[PDB]
Amino acid sequence: XXXXXXXXXXXXXXXXXXXXXXXXXXXXXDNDLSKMSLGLAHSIGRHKLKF
Amino acid sequence: NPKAFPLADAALTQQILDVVQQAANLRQLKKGANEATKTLNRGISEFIIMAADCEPIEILLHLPLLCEDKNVPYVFVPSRVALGRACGVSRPVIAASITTNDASAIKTQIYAVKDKIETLL
Amino acid sequence: IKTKKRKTLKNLRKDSVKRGKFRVQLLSTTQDSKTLPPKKESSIIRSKDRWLNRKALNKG
Amino acid sequence: AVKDALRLVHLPSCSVFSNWPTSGTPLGKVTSVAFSPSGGLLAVGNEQGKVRLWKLNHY
Amino acid sequence: SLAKSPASTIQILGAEKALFRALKTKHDTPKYGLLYHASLVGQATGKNKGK
Amino acid sequence: TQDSNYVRTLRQIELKKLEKGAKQLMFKSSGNHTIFVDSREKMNEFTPEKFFNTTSEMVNRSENRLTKDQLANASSIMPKESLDKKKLKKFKQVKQHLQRETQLKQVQQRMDAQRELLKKGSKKKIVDSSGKISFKWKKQRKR
Amino acid sequence: KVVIEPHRHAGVYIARGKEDLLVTKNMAPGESVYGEKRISVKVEYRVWNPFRSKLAAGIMGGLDELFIAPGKKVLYLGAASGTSVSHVSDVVGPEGVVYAVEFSHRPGRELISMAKKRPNIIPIIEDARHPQKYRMLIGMVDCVFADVAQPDQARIIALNSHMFLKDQGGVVISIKANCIDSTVDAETVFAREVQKLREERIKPLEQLTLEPYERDHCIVVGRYMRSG
RNA sequence: UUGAGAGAUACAAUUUGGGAAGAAAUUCCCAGAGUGUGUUUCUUUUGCGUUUAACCUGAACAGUCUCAUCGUGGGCAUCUUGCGAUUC
């Protein structure tokens, strides 16, 4: 779907970059980011299997 | 049913329903869904034979919930009229439970079937 | 004498040294594992070899 | 397996006949049953050796 | 937890005090239990409240 | 039937106390614990005292293998003898329940086989060559 | 009255009484996550049942470097009904957060109920087979845990090894031979699965075979090297 | 009294590491190994002989009528003295 909007896309080596990208979330920062991450997980599962 | 899990084939079902028909001759076999639920809690159950075409299927799905806790094997033979006739009872039986008796003459033939049921798990 | 040194070479060839209640093995070298497919297991290939070289067919 | 164990089933109604066989209908361990092709007779074996013969009086 | 119990223990789910008295001393088990106040057991009469 | 409830109930007294009894109790473990070491000469110079940085007794026991740096029962009365006796008895109690229950199940198994002789069906009196008596009911669909 | 002892692993403790017992502090009192008992000595302390949790048997089996710490974060595969992650949540304390992954629903509902009582436990109801299905929720966890019963168990960790491991971070792998072969000795399995992990940059340090708790199981300890 | 391989254990000679105690030698404690013998275990190769064996099943207990269960009477204590089990 990223290959549909007139720009190239590539993969298969960005995992080390995604590691540094996931390390960058601590750089932009950290605990309050996890609390936003918590209710994200708490809603995305409870929507799926429950209610 | 798609809710059916491990469901034996055409082949192993003939082996399972032969042992059922030989355990009902030794009277080693508790019959029905509400009695196979008993032998799990007492722990004297060897394994659990269940039917697949029971309508509704949800009335015997607690036995795969119960057997996963107590580590007792279970399969689904496909049809409840079959397991009824192989159990010695005129009514259709949707879940049958082989009890544990180590003095039994059929003890060897149970553990041959039991290993094939744990093979599917 | 001649065979007594071969048995001590097994005390060089071995890698799994037991320490009482414990044991210690070693990781092999990576290039010996990567550049070579792992070795044929005996309990499978003897089942092939005994079966074709069977007394019930009069071979040889 | 059991003595006196022949049962007749009517067709297409799938109703077992109720009057015959009675209790006092001598059969024995029925091992060999046979119908006539033509006259409507019925021959029932046993284990004792006695082939006891009936007649379906409709036919 | 209730559906994992069999059928015959949903009779005597209430009357547990008179049950284990009647098993530990050899006696007769209670036959209704908490199910007795259903609208349908009361519609029956006699021994048919048991059946 | 009343006999095969009172034995059946006292078995479940003894079996549910088997689970409550084993839940408090602690079993020392005896399993294989192999250590993977990169070089054969590090392997030959291995010592459990050095690798786990423990000392004499803290090598062999697996519940608490503490660091010598981490190092840097008499509050309970009589720790050598009385406490270790009362350490042992909690096993020997639940050792007895397991000996009580399996003895008590066989009272049911020989009672339940006696109770199933009365009902219906045609039974065959067989005796094994060992001398034990079991029965074999006839292949007959009960109605 | 009850002697309490620090375990060599931080957060873990061992209580001494008439009967010995392995124990852990709780974050929230007044709750039994699976109906276990607890001791309150004041500070609450909660038993681990080693026959129900393989990590509980892994500690008490005698294990050198469990990478789970208080300050660290730890990802968890195979969080079926949350019997062990509430021990993992209670050994990381408030500071470490635990990522619990599960694919099955009916025991997953207990984990949904358990996140409401624990701040560390967050659930992952997505499939552990495809880790990019939940890539956004987790980033750079320190060490992971395996309890999955799938036969591609070196495969499913390897796709969680590349994407979510902190580099030079540990790994804990629990393997049964009953999953994989059930025909050869369980020792013969463990040589096969260790060689699988060296193909995915995991250098295994130790393995411990739980003999008196579960039959023919294992725990495998390694360090994920030179990849993030 | 085949070939080899591995494991356990008993024994003796002998060593590793760790801890304290002694100026060193030395001392004790704890953990661990290999070697020589005895023993024992399972797996494997080969030689000779053998080609079926074991279990199950079909109308497989019963006219000297069989079995079950509850009781009664007697024996066996110079002891089947009798388990909610089956002493005859």
Q: Are β-strands C22-26 and B74-77 bridged in parallel, bridged antiparallel, or unpaired?
A: unpaired
CA dihedral G77, G82, G86, G89 (to 10 degrees): 30
Residue with tokens 């470097």: G65
With helix as H, strand as E and coil as C, how does chain A read? CHHHCCCCCCCCCHHHHHHHHHHHHHHHCCHHHHHHHHHHHHHHHHHHCCC
CA dihedral G151, G153, G155, G160 (to 10 degrees): 150
Q: How far apart, in whole angstroms, are the C-alpha atoms of residue F82 and residue B63?
A: 47
In the Cβ-directed half-sphere of G89, how many Cα atoms lie within 13 Å? 23
Q: Which two tokens stand for residue G72?
A: 């660290």
Contact of B26 with chain F, judged by CB distance below 8 Å, is answered with: yes
Q: Which two tokens stand for residue G211?
A: 């003999």
F122 touches strand H (CB under 7 A): yes
Contact of G207 with chain F, judged by CB distance below 8 Å, is answered with: yes
Of G13, G97, G75, G77, residue with least CA distance to G48: G13
Pair E28, F6: CB distance under 8 Å: no
Residue E37 DSSP class: G
Pair F60, F47: CB distance under 8 Å: no
F16, amino acid identity: K
Q: Which of E1, E4, E12 is the best substitution to test chain B (most B C-beta atoms within 10 A)?
A: E4
Q: Which of F6, F8, F16 is the best substitution to test chain E (most E C-beta atoms within 10 A)?
A: F6
In the Cβ-directed half-sphere of G82, how many Cα atoms lie within 13 Å? 30
Q: How far apart, in whole angstroms, are the C-alpha atoms of residue B110 and residue C24?
A: 42
What is the dihedral sign for C-alpha F109, F114, F120, F125? positive
Q: Do B66 and E6 touch (CB under 8 A)?
A: no
Pair F54, F65: CB distance under 8 Å: yes
Q: What is the CA radius of gyration of chain B?
A: 13
Q: How far apart, in whole angstroms, are the C-alpha atoms of residue B39 and residue B32?
A: 11
In the Cβ-directed half-sphere of F27, how many Cα atoms lie within 13 Å? 20
Q: How far apart, in whole angstroms, are the C-alpha atoms of residue B105 and residue E15?
A: 41
- What residues does each domain of chain B span? 1-121
Residue F53 DSSP class: T
Q: Which two tokens stand for residue F64?
A: 């608490």
Q: How far apart, in whole angstroms, are the C-alpha atoms of residue D26 and residue G121?
A: 79
Residue with tokens 């966890």: G141
Beta-carbon contacts of G101 under 8 Å, excluding residues fewer than 6 positions away, are G75, G76, G77, G78, G79, G124, G126, G128, G134
Residue with tokens 């078995």: F11
CATH 3.40.50.720 describes domain B1-121: no
Q: How far apart, in whole angstroms, are the C-alpha atoms of residue G157 and residue G131?
A: 10
Beta-carbon contacts of E9 under 8 Å, excluding residues fewer than 6 positions away, are none
This PDB structure is determined at a resolution in Å of: 3.8
Q: How far apart, in whole angstroms, are the C-alpha atoms of residue G112 and residue G79?
A: 11
Length of chain B: 121
Q: Which two tokens stand for residue G29?
A: 């009192």
Q: How far apart, in whole angstroms, are the C-alpha atoms of residue B72 and residue G190?
A: 26
Q: Do C19 and F46 touch (CB under 8 A)?
A: yes
| Residues preceding chain discontinuities in chain E with C to N over 2.5 Å | none
Of G225, G51, G68, residue with least CA distance to G145: G68
Residue with tokens 């929507």: A47
Method: cryo-EM
Residue G202 DSSP class: E
F56 touches strand H (CB under 7 A): yes
Q: Which two tokens stand for residue G62?
A: 């005698």
Alpha helices in G165-215 (DSSP H): 177-180, 186-198
Q: Which two tokens stand for residue C49?
A: 């070899």
Pair F92, F25: CB distance under 8 Å: no
Residue G165 DSSP class: B
